[model samples]
Target: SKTITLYLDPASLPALNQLMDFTQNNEDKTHPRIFGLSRFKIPDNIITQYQNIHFVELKDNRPTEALFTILDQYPGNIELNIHLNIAHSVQLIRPILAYRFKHLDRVSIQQLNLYDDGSMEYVDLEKEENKDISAEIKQAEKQLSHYLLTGKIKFDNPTIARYVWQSAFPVKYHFLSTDYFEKAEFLQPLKEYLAENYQKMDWTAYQQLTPEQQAFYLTLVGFNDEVKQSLEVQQAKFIFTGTTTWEGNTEVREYYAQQQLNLLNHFTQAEGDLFIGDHYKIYFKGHPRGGEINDYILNNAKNITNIPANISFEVLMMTGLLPDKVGGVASSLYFSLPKEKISHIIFTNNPYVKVMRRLGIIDESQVIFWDSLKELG
Candidate 1:
């Protein structure tokens, strides 16, 4: 029986990389028919590369009955897998429910778990040691519903809210990358977790972003018409990454917001700031998912120019527009950039960043402590 995989998550690009590499060599005997059903655009070349693979752009993300007709053409016992990230958008997950309406027995949920080095696997939520996985997803849903209702995000102590658990239709699949837990002991917990839950699987080397992949990613946020050309290293501008810690009074929110402010002050309070030489411009790009640079940075002290919120920091990093002296309190974007390109400012004091450092994703020399900004001046 052949498989049909619907890649619904935007971060599944790495997974797609593995798919392309495997299909070119193994051909139909091992390959699954693939469909990318995301608002994110796939480069035309990548979409048309193989006959069995296709792309369906999401205009409204509703995936009306008209769109569901694509499945009608595929006959036989086609095992349908809906791939997702833990925090996939509400719209993306709707397709899962839509698929199960008639094909409940034929469909299964495949959660794609990725890592910094691109070594990742499909995690089954219903499987062992992941008892908390579904719990977390439910908790997150309630928390979000509360925000939608109250205009705030508050996860109280023993957050008592009426929210029912829904079926996630969990199941599992192939490990497309080699698992190496040699030095990064921080990742060992995951290795052990997967070791108990999954069987031995194939090993494939991690593929860096290909040119076509990069072109595909540019279509994700803004800069769609951007031409493919090598960038000449230009004069440095100080850019700060945005965080989502702004709303509500939760301790986690308050603590992270304070830390972000402190980082902004590093430049705002700089005396004759060496980092922002008079010629250099200052820009702020917020987190892609509803996060914006706080007004405190704009009004009181840090005078900053805003990059359109639609533009993603990752797109900037991928395009080589990322500055050499960048800063973020603990923007998750920092954790994804190439380690060699991590030369810049970050507050190591933030607990979230402390984890990034302890995990060896970043180190001491790169960290710019709070008081040390004066020295940079």
Candidate 2:
């Protein structure tokens, strides 16, 4: 099986360290707050279940040096997360890296900046709210046309879908409960786990409270009271909703509101030769093209010729403005091919989404296509 690795460069070490030392002190080195997977010991029994775990400090190490070391052995499906300050270097390098890994399934490019250095700005789209600005758009088009004819300027996608969420410029992947737990019995439990174990809470003590006291305790605790209460009734009868229904970050919120841009499959290689099967799903984090590689799968090993080498996917295409960081700048798009195809491609400096998307992960109804597929996890 391929491995899912997360890389943390030195630029954002302060934030990473803060996240690591969240609830402990330096003397308590046994549990350093910032250690990645395999480094933190939960149980020996649990550790063996995971295939690979690593922790590398990129203090004196160069980006090329650290990245090349991994690329030498780990080639495909690399979930490269670049954590650093938002400098000119990040913007230039991030896109350049994406162009490099265009052959791979996904890449997660992220930056952690404290101040609003004006990377991505928001543009209001409500026509009624911006009547004056709406007229300006038309005027700008005329001016743009003159410049185009004179070869003085180039007109980008001035469509509403392109400019709406401009301020979400720098993108990061904040995993959503809906993606993993919309129908999960453990969704609520996981929330409690993150809040209790990660958020540091007295979950056991809180559970003992009566109904009236429970409300007070919840209020005092200052947690996700609404979701906690929603699950309080009938969490079992649920399907996937957007991130807003659960806890999420500003980027997720903006994607929810802005929707996403639509994009077509741009694979330069032959889809069939690069694949063992024919079928693809493009998971959008924003309205459509503007997010992370959420989930995907491909199968059917024999009789490859009869199948059409087609790549099919769903995208927001053109909806409304994109967010900066996200409203627009924070965008990602990738395709899913068969396992044989994945094995043939090599990846670098990119973030790949690790999905339990084997045929077994499919529901019972979906299993009719493959009677042979069995559950793995």
Candidate 3:
């Protein structure tokens, strides 16, 4: 039997640290290579643990300087298997390296070139209702195959199938979940495992939450009596969403603030209920990354109450914290909201959205534009 090696270049920072630390504790530092797989180059002092099993060529994210120079090695009768989280610079380079160097025998790319917004809806399109959608996706997958082959993405539509077939053809062996594996179930547990490893969470206590804080917690928590009493049910409140554009200190950031602020005006004017009715309230559901831009909106925008960004927006919608008229600028939450409540999920058409459209990350046609709403007043 031949030997097989798995390289992780592990994307999660804490994951790499914990793994390197685990390997560090062992007397055989090179043993980490068996488990470490690895990531981008770290300064020597940063991870002194990697002294022997540094996996130097394993994570040469640096192309010419360290990558090409070190990847020219072959172990007698030993095969290589490496993992990848799709959508990256190293991913492109790895294919080239594997072809030229014959270093990697097997490749697995996850975050699977599936949907951008994260839904497995199209993964199984057996239903008759999805038949039309199946055609649209098949067309897009063809386009995607072209892009994968030529390094050119063709459409700006977000719903286009994100499958990458170019990688499937290369190398001696490939592990493709979306296509090669028949039962998504067979591959789903791996997703669960990746989800587990992607987080540094045990959910034991708050003091323990380090990188799991950024683990993309979608789990929801409701309000206590004091908070529950804060907003009574049945009263329709217009929910205005915020984004992370505040971190940028440029004129464009200010412009993003202004466009986002106007979503409120567009909602009030187009809906009629909030424009004159003193009874209705407007809630600003800030994004976790909201900062100076949020403050700018608070100062310039009127009659809007700032709500906690920590709470999941879907939780708010479920607990009746969000109303039917939820809105944002190019945010995808509009699509996930309960369909019954999709009457007026307004999004502002702005430069960011326009840019996204050009880049093919968003579909302009599917978005409900703010200006498209007919004035109810």
Candidate 4:
């Protein structure tokens, strides 16, 4: 008999514990259930139930709600699996159900992490010499890294607080495209448009042109010649952010930063500004920058502020959670997501999100869950 498996992160333990407590204390006599799942463990008689539970943490300390919806729908008397990170706790007990039922329908959700450090290890990257990072932030990043690399902090940066239900949370809406190729003909004219523009502008100008011009240049307003090549030439890019360490560890830190900066400089140096609502998700790769990032690229970001209305942008740092280092610079990294397609929320695909601010965009909002949920009463 294949037993159900569940992988849970340490951060999710609190939520599970709450469920056990609820089950044990439930006054409803009709369907009495104990909230304590782990405390009871697998009863000897139920050993045949064979369930595996695996817990893995996300890189950043996101919230438990990020994965809780799926876990709540689980049904029982079947195999289950789960994994979780430890840094956050889940909130929002719907009117229809209680916490004792985090794992229902026998469906299990587990978190998987690398756990690079030992159980008690606290990764602190602070040093007196490193100016890139602050003492407090450096210490936090170390613990955060351990929390992430281990199964202790099962949250990602984008959705950390929401999953844990920390304080009153903010609401976010995400749009995904279920039907992408339905408008193939509409794309043909776009190619003819790009060809027309290519004849007039250089690559540097093309790269740095405002979103409006870029769109006009590439698609040529749905012209015949431009439509032909739209499919072949359109490609998104990635960007990285990070600097040297106080100890001057240049190998990974500097290499990554230069690589990303060089790419941005190449496109931005000769070009003007990038527009918003151009559908780009900037990726801030490399090490995390400490303190104020404005000092690093104020001039470059001037136009970023000029982005047109309806254009959206965001910043996605590499693993956003890492040990502290110094000489770090925070420039807006760059990434791109298709304006038409909503379902493909690939935050890691490109570097555009990082430098969105340089383009005058900010992603200070939460990312809604992929799954729909029961409304709060």
Considering every candidate listed, which one attains the maximal TM-score?
A: 1
Q: For all candidates, what are the clash counts?
A: 0, 37, 5, 105
Query: Candidate 4: minimum summed lDDT over ten consecutive residues — where?
Result: 116-125
Backbone clashes, candidate 2: 37
How far residue 274's Cα lies from its native spot in candidate 1, in Å, is 9.2
TM-score of 4: 0.20
Question: In model 3, how many backbone clashes occur?
Answer: 5
Local distance difference test, each candidate: 0.45, 0.25, 0.42, 0.26
Point out the higher-scoring one by TM-score: 2 or 4.
2
Q: Rank the candidates by TM-score, best first.
A: 1, 3, 2, 4
Give the per-residue lDDT of model 4 (tens digit) for 1-377: 12322323232223222222222322333321212122123233323222322222232333244334433434444332222222222211221123224335443222211111111111111111123222333344444444433434332331222122211222111111101111223322322322222121011333444554343322211122332322123334222233323344546544433333343333233341211222332333232222122223323332322111111122111112111211112221212222232221112112233223222233444322212212211
TM-score: the better of candidates 3 and 4: 3
Q: Candidate 2: where are CA atoms >4 Å away?
A: 1-3, 9-62, 87-377
Error of 4 at 182 (Å): 57
Q: Indicate the worst ten consecutive residues by lDDT in candidate 2.
A: 306-315
TM-score of 2: 0.21
State residue 179's C-alpha deviation in candidate 4, in Å. Answer: 49
Greater lDDT among 2 and 3 belongs to 3
lDDT (Cα, 0-100) at 77 in candidate 2: 47
Query: Lowest-lDDT window of 10 residues in candidate 1?
Result: 157-166
Cα error, residue 82 of model 1, in Å, equals 4.1
